[PDB]
DNA sequence: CCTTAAAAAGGAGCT
DNA sequence: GCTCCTTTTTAAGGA
């Protein structure tokens, strides 16, 4: 009955916001929580501590940009096999077992420019470590369907190539496919008064089966919205 | 590429 | 390491 919660926190270099995120995570009580864009540099890795979530695996560059992290609840059990940390801090893959069941989580943050090509280059750069139990989530910085933009301007070529490279490895957009005809968005761009869903949850089709519920959470922490996923 | 808004990060000047 | 203000950063439409 585990729950996974993805969020683009947009910077964590102030201790006050760190305690705010602490309280928010305690209130949400996720089995696993995926943070993107911590803007934490590796020197500062040790500053991300949240009581009740002792196990934290981040990936940080040497500049206050990007920075991903995966937090595991003390209430749950997590036995990791192998962990791959991006040298630049844009993705981290944690592979192992959650409640005895196998699971490989890819927490990804793509740059805004050339986002779909970056996502697929990582996706096929790692596929030997990819498998049938995969869960790739995070800050895609790109739409996937035409409904992921309020403008509804139908989707770029690189993005549909990505939605089909998902296909050639049998990965599918858990949210788009447990929720098509969606008008829920994760990011609001003020300079344009537009809305988009650039944050995503994308898993193996094997695990369709297990996926029970998805949800989208407004918060006071970031200009992005969090995505919750119930697993049983 | 260039511009935007608005928040995150940085920096001056004192504590 | 502050307060208060300046600069950088980040998503995204328009040329």
Residue numbers in the entry: 7 to 238
Lines quoted from the article behind this entry:
Two mutations were introduced into L1-EN to facilitate crystallization of the enzyme complexed with DNA: D145A to prevent DNA cleavage and Y226K to alter crystal packing. The double mutant protein L1-EN-D145A/Y226K was readily crystallized in complex with two DNA substrates, dna14 and dna17, and structures were solved to a resolution of 2.8 Å. There is one DNA-protein complex in an asymmetric unit in crystals of L1-EN-D145A/Y226K with dna14 and two complexes in an asymmetric unit in crystals of the protein with dna17. Crystal packing is completely different in the case of the L1-EN/dna14 complex, where the terminal single nucleotide overhangs form Watson–Crick base pairs with symmetry-related dna14 molecules, thereby stabilizing the B-form helical conformation. In the complex of dna14 with L1-EN, we observed extended electron density around the A+1 phosphate at the scissile bond. Instead, we modeled two alternative conformations for this phosphate group with one corresponding to the typical conformation expected for a B-form helix (as observed in both complexes with dna17) and another where coordinated rotation of torsion bonds moves the phosphate closer to the active site residues, while largely preserving the positions of both 3′ and 5′ deoxyriboses. Importantly, this rotation brings the scissile bond phosphate group closer to active site amino acids Glu43 and Asp145. Thus, the observed rotation brings the scissile phosphate into a position favorable for nucleophilic attack and the proposed transition state (see details below). In the alternative conformation of dna14 bound to L1-EN, the rotated-out phosphate group is even closer to Glu43. Our structural analysis of the L1-EN-dna14 complex revealed rotation of the scissile bond phosphate group leading to two distinct states for the nucleophilic attack and a subsequent transition state.
